[PDB]
Amino acid sequence: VDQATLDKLEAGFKKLQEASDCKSLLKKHLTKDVFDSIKNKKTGMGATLLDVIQSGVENLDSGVGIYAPDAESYRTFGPLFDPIIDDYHGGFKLTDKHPPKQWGDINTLVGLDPAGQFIISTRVRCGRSLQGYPFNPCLTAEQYKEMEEKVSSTLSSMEDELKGTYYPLTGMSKATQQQLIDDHFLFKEGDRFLQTANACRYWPTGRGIFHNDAKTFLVWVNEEDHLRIISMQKGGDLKTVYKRLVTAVDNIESKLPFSHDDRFGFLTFCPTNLGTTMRASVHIQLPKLAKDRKVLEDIASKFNLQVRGTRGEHTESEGGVYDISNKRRLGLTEYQAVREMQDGILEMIKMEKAAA
Ligand SMILES: Nc1ncnc2c1ncn2[C@@H]1O[C@H](COP(=O)(O)OP(=O)(O)O)[C@@H](O)[C@H]1O
Ligand SMILES: NC(=[NH2+])NCCC[C@H](N)C(=O)O
Ligand SMILES: [Mg+2]
Numbered sequence: 001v002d003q004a005t006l007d008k009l010e011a012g013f014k015k016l017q018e019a020s021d022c023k024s025l026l027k028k029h030l031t032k033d034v035f036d037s038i039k040n041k042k043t044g045m046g047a048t049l050l051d052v053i054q055s056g057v058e059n060l061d062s063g064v065g066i067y068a069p070d071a072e073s074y075r076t077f078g079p080l081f082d083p084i085i086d087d088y089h090g091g092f093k094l095t096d097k098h099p100p101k102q103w104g105d106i107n108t109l110v111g112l113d114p115a116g117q118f119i120i121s122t123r124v125r126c127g128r129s130l131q132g133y134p135f136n137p138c139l140t141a142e143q144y145k146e147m148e149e150k151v152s153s154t155l156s157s158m159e160d161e162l163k164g165t166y167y168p169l170t171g172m173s174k175a176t177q178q179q180l181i182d183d184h185f186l187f188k189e190g191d192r193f194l195q196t197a198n199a200c201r202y203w204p205t206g207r208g209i210f211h212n213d214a215k216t217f218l219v220w221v222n223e224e225d226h227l228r229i230i231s232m233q234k235g236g237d238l239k240t241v242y243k244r245l246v247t248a249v250d251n252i253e254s255k256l257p258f259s260h261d262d263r264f265g266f267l268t269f270c271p272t273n274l275g276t277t278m279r280a281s282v283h284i285q286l287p288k289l290a291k292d293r294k295v296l297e298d299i300a301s302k303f304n305l306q307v308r309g310t311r312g313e314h315t316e317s318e319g320g321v322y323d324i325s326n327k328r329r330l331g332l333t334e335y336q337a338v339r340e341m342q343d344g345i346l347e348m349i350k351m352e353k354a355a356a
Pocket of ligand 1: 098122123310
């Protein structure tokens with residue numbers, strides 16, 4: 001590694017040490033030993049530790065703070081990734097390997113809120129990376145364009161419920177983009193954590209969204225991951241939402257080669273998204289449990305759930321609507337991940353009904 005990058009690394013390490021109230025997993029796990037062990041390393045694509053940690057150095061409010069510029073980085077900088085992955089995912093040892101893909105028995109999934117008084121909408125997403133393309137910080141503009149063509153052409157073959165249209169972000173009207181984001185379908189533009197990871201270069205080239213006309217099946221192209229594959233609808237019918245996601249992911253996988261790792265399962269740009277890559281969520285109102293929000297977050301954590309705002313992570317709740325989802329994605333099957341959301345949300349609703 002070049003001196004300028006080493007210099008920047010020493011200054012970032014210092015900045016993290018000095019930030020007394022920073023609570024990122026980067027600060028917690030980047031010890032002097034770990035840092036010295038990997039700061040002179042570089043991947044075959046030229047990714048350095050600075051590329052890995054810069055977002056967490058610049059955004060001290062990060063919860064995690066690191067990303068992988070390429071797949072190799074997960075091992076080149078293993079002494080930092082491994083403890084962070086073990087911490088975030090609630091246990092994932094050096095000797096552990098993510099299990100084979102296993103959607104489970106869908107008929108064991110239920111309707112999460114039959115009377116309809118708490119849950120607004122239910123969503124399940126996965127992420128996938130295309131074999132032969134590195135993650136965002138290592139992509140060229142031309143590669144973004146190649147990937148967009150490949151994914152949009154593949155999605156032109158979706159049929160029946162999943163048939164839909166690709167809408168590139170380049171050329172999309174501001175009004176349409178804002179409506180799709182306000183309606184919770186399209187990814188936000190301008191995320192500071194992704195920007196400082198150099199994940200948004202050449203924006204909006206190569207970025208876009210595919211969706212069926214009802215907007216119950218969507219695919220994001222070239223946001224944080226090469227693909228995010230999404231099923232969602234109003235209400236609490238997790239069984240329906242999940243079955244549509246399964247159908248779509250199995251069909252897309254038969255067509256496009258995605259990166260999968262013996263230890264980490266499906267590869268993604270952030271270590272929180274490895275393994276199953278799955279985030280199953282509800283938009284839910286729980287006014288009594290959320291009155292003291294520390295009670296909401298504490299309750300959620302005991303069910304291995306995460307609370308996000310209405311417009312996603314790093315946002316506030318609006319009108320009492322919280323996004324609550326499984327936090328863990330690696331070291332448990334797809335079935336186990338969606339069941340952590342189902343089981344936890346059914347109990348939070350029971351607790352809300354029982355609360356004073
Ligand atoms: N259950 C849900 N219902 C409706 N919209 C949802 C739901 N869960 C998440 N969203 C939306 O998903 C978008 C992405 O939020 P984000 O927190 O970045 O999640 P991810 O990237 O994991 O999909 C936002 O527009 C957010 O409002
Ligand atoms: N979209 C994500 N990968 N979210 C989890 C990480 C987000 C951000 N890098 C942080 O450390 O808080
Ligand atoms: Mg996101």
